[PDB]
Design an enzyme around this catalytic site. Structure first.
Site, PDB file in Angstrom:
ATOM      1  N   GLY A 165      63.983  37.825   2.399  1.00 45.90           N
ATOM      2  CA  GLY A 165      63.847  39.113   3.032  1.00 45.90           C
ATOM      3  C   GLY A 165      64.241  39.149   4.488  1.00 45.90           C
ATOM      4  O   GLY A 165      64.404  40.223   5.071  1.00 45.90           O
ATOM      5  N   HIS A 166      64.458  37.985   5.083  1.00 43.79           N
ATOM      6  CA  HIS A 166      64.468  37.887   6.534  1.00 43.79           C
ATOM      7  C   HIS A 166      65.794  38.260   7.184  1.00 43.79           C
ATOM      8  O   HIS A 166      65.961  38.004   8.375  1.00 43.79           O
ATOM      9  CB  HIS A 166      64.062  36.480   6.948  1.00 43.79           C
ATOM     10  CG  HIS A 166      65.102  35.455   6.658  1.00 43.79           C
ATOM     11  ND1 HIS A 166      66.027  35.055   7.595  1.00 43.79           N
ATOM     12  CD2 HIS A 166      65.389  34.774   5.525  1.00 43.79           C
ATOM     13  CE1 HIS A 166      66.826  34.157   7.056  1.00 43.79           C
ATOM     14  NE2 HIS A 166      66.463  33.966   5.802  1.00 43.79           N
ATOM     15  N   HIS A 167      66.736  38.851   6.459  1.00 42.46           N
ATOM     16  CA  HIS A 167      67.893  39.460   7.086  1.00 42.46           C
ATOM     17  C   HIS A 167      67.943  40.958   6.860  1.00 42.46           C
ATOM     18  O   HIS A 167      68.955  41.591   7.173  1.00 42.46           O
ATOM     19  CB  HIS A 167      69.175  38.827   6.578  1.00 42.46           C
ATOM     20  CG  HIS A 167      69.450  37.471   7.122  1.00 42.46           C
ATOM     21  ND1 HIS A 167      69.594  37.228   8.468  1.00 42.46           N
ATOM     22  CD2 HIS A 167      69.602  36.278   6.503  1.00 42.46           C
ATOM     23  CE1 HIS A 167      69.832  35.944   8.649  1.00 42.46           C
ATOM     24  NE2 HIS A 167      69.847  35.345   7.475  1.00 42.46           N
ATOM     25  N   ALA A 168      66.884  41.536   6.311  1.00 39.10           N
ATOM     26  CA  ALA A 168      66.864  42.958   5.990  1.00 39.10           C
ATOM     27  C   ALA A 168      66.337  43.727   7.193  1.00 39.10           C
ATOM     28  O   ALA A 168      65.153  44.055   7.280  1.00 39.10           O
ATOM     29  CB  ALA A 168      66.031  43.209   4.747  1.00 39.10           C
ATOM     30  N   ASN A 211      66.050  37.725  11.478  1.00 33.10           N
ATOM     31  CA  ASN A 211      66.329  39.006  12.114  1.00 33.10           C
ATOM     32  C   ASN A 211      65.857  40.201  11.302  1.00 33.10           C
ATOM     33  O   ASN A 211      65.614  41.265  11.880  1.00 33.10           O
ATOM     34  CB  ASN A 211      67.822  39.105  12.440  1.00 33.10           C
ATOM     35  CG  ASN A 211      68.701  38.772  11.255  1.00 33.10           C
ATOM     36  OD1 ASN A 211      68.208  38.424  10.201  1.00 33.10           O
ATOM     37  ND2 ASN A 211      70.005  38.922  11.412  1.00 33.10           N
TER      38      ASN A 211
END
Ligand SMILES: [Zn+2]
Ligand SMILES: [Zn+2]
Lengths: 651, 661
Positions: A165-168, A211
């Site tokens: 999930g950590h680039h959404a 991000n």
């Protein structure tokens, strides 16, 4: 028969309990669609086979009795299922913008070529027709795990859950990430229960930058966002400015963000262990989280195709145990990334037995001696968090660059070094200062052994100044300058040359100021070297077996004795403890045969993390990589190999 | 409703068969040893009936904490004796006698026959060995029941190394951390911990070879300290007060610099608290400082856990405030450091209630839990705790690898015997400062030294002007080691000399005094010089101040107008000497640049107008990121310290020349 107690119920709080997990047979469906053939020789950068291998390595290692490797409702007495259903969307738009979610809502009804467009436009993304519940179900599972976490329905929870999930990011994503799972979870547990959930630490060491998760709580104080990732600002994915160390948060969140980047791949255990025990534990006290959501990602382990690290499973199990300690069993360990399928299984096999309740295993390498980007990486992070936090103020003399013009009046820092050296080498070994006059240097700087004329075998050592080790105090600021020790790195080989009774000449070189390569020290080394060989040593008739020994700087003057003079009619083999200094190659001038002789009988020792080694020419001539770092380390350590090499080069 | 609904209409074939699982810690339960036969041996009272006070060694302390664990449902037995059936979460340990071959490995035979003689001695001789052998209680029944503390100390450990228990305990009286072969003391009949710890390795050197010993009973484990003193196999850690003799035991062997002896060096680590009243802050500091990285760097095969809650939050002799949750966290984080190769042994705790809650917390950690978290997380230890732990991890780089290259120590190596010899290649730089400033101020202005003859320091440490006797007006510039500014090469602890700007800020006051042509004693404080190593330069610098004032300064022929410039922490003894001696007719002023140092505690001795005379005679300037009536005109300044030295140097000399009008 006189009674004081009855039979009564035993009273504990943790471990009669079972370990909750997050796993789904429908998370495998969001995959990448066939465009190129390079994607076969790519490692399938988010492959859907990262789940079941980990789900193999725990089930066939005794921790799960299963005949099927799928869902049967009898889960034994150590594992819990967390039932994840199809979630709603206001949890998603706690972070996200709405037409980001309408872009994801479109993908239910889009055709193929439109997703080829939006994967050409998405910043290293992939989609599929089956991506709608795969965008929602990791976030709804991240809420459904954390609800069982902070109440303590589970004793600990973990998520073998894909996609990450950590680039959404809220406006438009980029980076293979559909919706952010953990950031939606951490918003909705604060805003469903600010009675149980009061403060959350989110930690990540998936080595792509979070991000998609940072800006969700870049403003927020209640999430202490600690991130660990390679920065590599354009090259490795992604290099945002949100990944940089200056991101201390925003407004109320100032001090509640903590970025840790990694300048190179190929790092090991005590990198992560030593970094973990420096930053993660004291502010993980002082911040007072209830839950730490713990973000794994297998782009960073031993055997990864891209991260290419050396980090053991055991390092992961030890940080599993200490964040089990740092929370009160409010544990939500989640997974994001991975390239390999072989880093994942050894690491999950270490970590999930910690989260049953076993201690993690002892270290296969307890000696990483960590790579120095990790050593100098976190220091400015402690500077900005000590600008915001008590837990590193005064523990490291912190207390929350100002003048450059006081330079003309200064304690001159090198005179009593060579005066002190001159006095103990003038009494214990009684060195004649034989002054190289009609030159420029201080007088007591060329210290010879007497009767250097009749002494055939001459050992010369040129060096820099002495090394200066120091202690800095911890109570208030500045550097405890008495406990600076003066590392005279020339004493032992002087004792060897006087053990064998050689002509010892020592030359110190005063350095050049504020300079990358000690260049005018090299200039006066050519003045010294050319003056000694062109003024007295040909007029020493009784001479054989000379060796030059350079410590640190100024190798290019002795290189200039080789490639510009025939000094090898008397000398035999040159010695250089280079270490961290720049390479001084022998230029081929009269021939490349004297450079080949240089390539056969010479010694240069340089560091592990020096310019190369990340092959070279024959004009460098047998430069030797060393992993024990420091001039002092190789001077005390390979005393013995030096006195075997040059006595092999002598009789 | 859904889309997929996968068709598995089959006998799905079995992957892994019926088997016992691969788990390898905690399928079994904690062992507990208890017998009423340890509850026998006591003291003989003489003057009054002294059962008012229970003695700190007492037969009911075991039954107190055993009753605390009886409250929490762990024991089904109504009698509270030592029986085996309790439920399902622990398991009981049986005890045979320590035989004489099991205990005379270390002990002298005179000790064993002496216990066997005071088994049947007369009551006058029970008082005679009570007064003769110091701090050991006696009574006419020893050897039939003193065999069992050391005997259970053997026989609990063989369940641990077999794998019949994860980890366990040893609740035990009498203690064993002050007992030797030839002697005893400290309420100790035998050393239960040395005869706990030898027998596992001697009866089984085929599974365990290297053992780490924890001790945080704040009386130092002194009798067992010598029992493994050359034993290189056994790494030892003790945490204890020092007090210069005054806490018990209080010797030179209860000191932090004892690394070991012979081949046993690097296997002995002492921790001295210079002042008590410590809490959870210093223990969770130090517990992650030294214990974890060398405990990963070493990796023992067994850990004996000398447990003493005499420093617990509620206990009276150790006087400290360490809560049970700290004891639970230090219980909890050492499961990972070994494999789980742990056994508690009861050593200390003499309040009846602090040991109860503390061992109640240790019990409900190591029956399988994490503890409750620390209730003050902005906890903030005493700074001298971290100062002594910096001196702990000072000399660790002469042996250990985990404490160099991470804690900025790899450049130096203290196996070099740190001196101006050759075998030291490390050389103390405060002598290079003072040899440079000695050579420098002698070729500049012909500057001389003093001796500290009758003071335990080296000679060229302190300087003064030539002919200080006829120097009718004396500035005293008092200085600590000065302040340099560079980039932080934080691998090694070495620095970059090119990026490093040293100010000799005191020298500007020296040359300003040469615009006044007045007398100077260049007094220097190297911070203890590290060489006598038991050392505090505070109090010895006050001895230098006594030595100068009461030996030289008053007895001067034209003496007048004496100025005093202390710098920071090197103004602290001027708080002493002006407090302790009357200088007020011969002092014109007394100057301080504190900066960001702490305040210094005012100690007056001669009159109470010292504070007001000193309030007249002081300009004191302090730093701005310092953020800071009886401490005499402490002016926080603006422009920084050395910007406020160039900002306030004019202020200080203008106050001095307007004292001169
Ligand atoms: Zn990821
Ligand atoms: Zn005690």
């Amino acid at each position: 028969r006189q009674v004081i107690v009855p039979v009564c119920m035993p009273k504990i709080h943790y471990s009669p309990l079972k370990t909750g997990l997050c796993y789904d047979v429908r998370m495998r469906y969001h995959a990448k669609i066939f465009t190129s053939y390079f994607e076969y020789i790519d490692p399938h950068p988010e492959d859907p086979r990262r789940i079941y291998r980990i789900y193999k390595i725990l089930a066939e290692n005794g921790l799960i009795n299963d005949p099927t490797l799928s869902g049967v409702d009898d889960l034994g007495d150590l594992m819990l299922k967390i039932p994840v259903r199809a979630a709603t969307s206001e949890e998603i738009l706690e972070v996200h913008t709405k037409e980001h979610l309408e872009f994801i809502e479109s993908t239910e009804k889009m055709s193929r070529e439109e997703l080829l467009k939006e994967t050409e436009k998405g910043d290293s993304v992939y989609f599929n027709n089956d991506s709608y519940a795969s965008a929602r179900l990791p976030c709804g599972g991240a809420i459904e795990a954390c609800k069982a976490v902070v109440e303590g329905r589970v004793k600990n929870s973990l998520a073998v859950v894909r996609p990450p999930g950590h680039h959404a990011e809220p406006q438009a994503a980029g980076g293979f990430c559909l919706f952010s799972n953990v950031a939606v979870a951490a918003k909705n547990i604060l805003k469903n229960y600010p009675e149980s959930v009061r403060r959350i630490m989110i930690l990540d060491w998936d080595i792509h930058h979070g991000n998609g998760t940072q800006k969700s709580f870049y403003q927020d104080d209640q999430v202490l966002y600690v991130s660990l990732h390679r920065f590599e600002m354009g090259k490795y994915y992604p290099g945002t400015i949100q990944g940089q160390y200056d991101q201390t948060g925003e407004g109320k969140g100032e001090g509640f963000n903590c970025n840790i980047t990694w300048p190179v791949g190929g790092v090991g255990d005590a990198e992560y262990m030593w970094a973990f025990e420096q930053v993660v534990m004291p502010m993980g006290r002082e911040f007072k989280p209830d839950l730490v959501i713990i973000s794994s990602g297998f782009d960073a382990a031993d055997g990864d195709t891209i991260g290419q690290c050396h980090v053991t499973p055991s390092c992961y199990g030890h940080m599993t145990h200490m964040l089990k300690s740092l929370a009160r069993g409010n544990l939500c360990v989640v997974l994001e990334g991975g390239y390999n399928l072989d880093a994942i299984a050894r690491s999950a096999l270490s970590v999930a037995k910690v989260l049953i309740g076993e201690p993690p295993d002892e270290l296969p390498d307890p000696l990483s001696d960590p790579k120095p980007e990790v050593i100098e990486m976190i220091d400015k992070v402690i500077r900005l968090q000590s600008k915001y936090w008590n837990c590193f103020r005064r523990r490291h003399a912190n207390s929350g660059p100002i003048n450059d013009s006081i330079i003309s009046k200064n304690f001159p820092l090198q005179k009593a070094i060579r005066q002190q050296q001159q006095h103990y080498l003038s009494d214990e070994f009684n060195f004649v200062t034989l002054p190289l006059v009609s030159m420029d240097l201080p007088d007591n700087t060329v210290l010879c052994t007497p009767n250097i004329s009749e002494s055939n075998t001459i050992i010369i050592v040129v060096h820099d100044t002495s090394d200066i080790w120091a202690k800095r105090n911890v109570i208030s600021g500045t550097i405890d300058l008495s406990s600076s020790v003066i590392i005279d790195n020339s004493l032992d080989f002087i004792k060897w040359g006087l053990d064998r009774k050689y002509g010892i000449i020592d030359v110190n070189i005063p350095l050049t100021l504020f300079e990358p390569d000690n260049y005018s020290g090299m200039i006066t080394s050519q003045e010294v070297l050319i003056y000694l060989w062109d003024n007295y040593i040909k007029y020493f008739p009784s001479v054989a077996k000379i060796a030059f020994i350079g410590i640190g700087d100024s190798y290019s003057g002795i290189v200039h004795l080789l490639g510009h003079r025939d000094t090898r009619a008397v000398t035999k083999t040159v010695i250089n403890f280079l270490g961290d200094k720049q390479l001084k190659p022998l230029v081929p001038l009269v021939d490349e045969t004297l450079s080949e002789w240089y390539f056969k009988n010479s010694l240069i020792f340089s560091n592990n993390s020096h310019q190369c080694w990340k092959k070279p020419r024959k004009k460098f001539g047998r430069v030797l990589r060393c992993d024990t770092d420091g001039l002092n380390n190789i001077i005390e350590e390979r005393f013995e190999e030096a006195t075997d090499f040059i006595l092999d080069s002598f009789e």
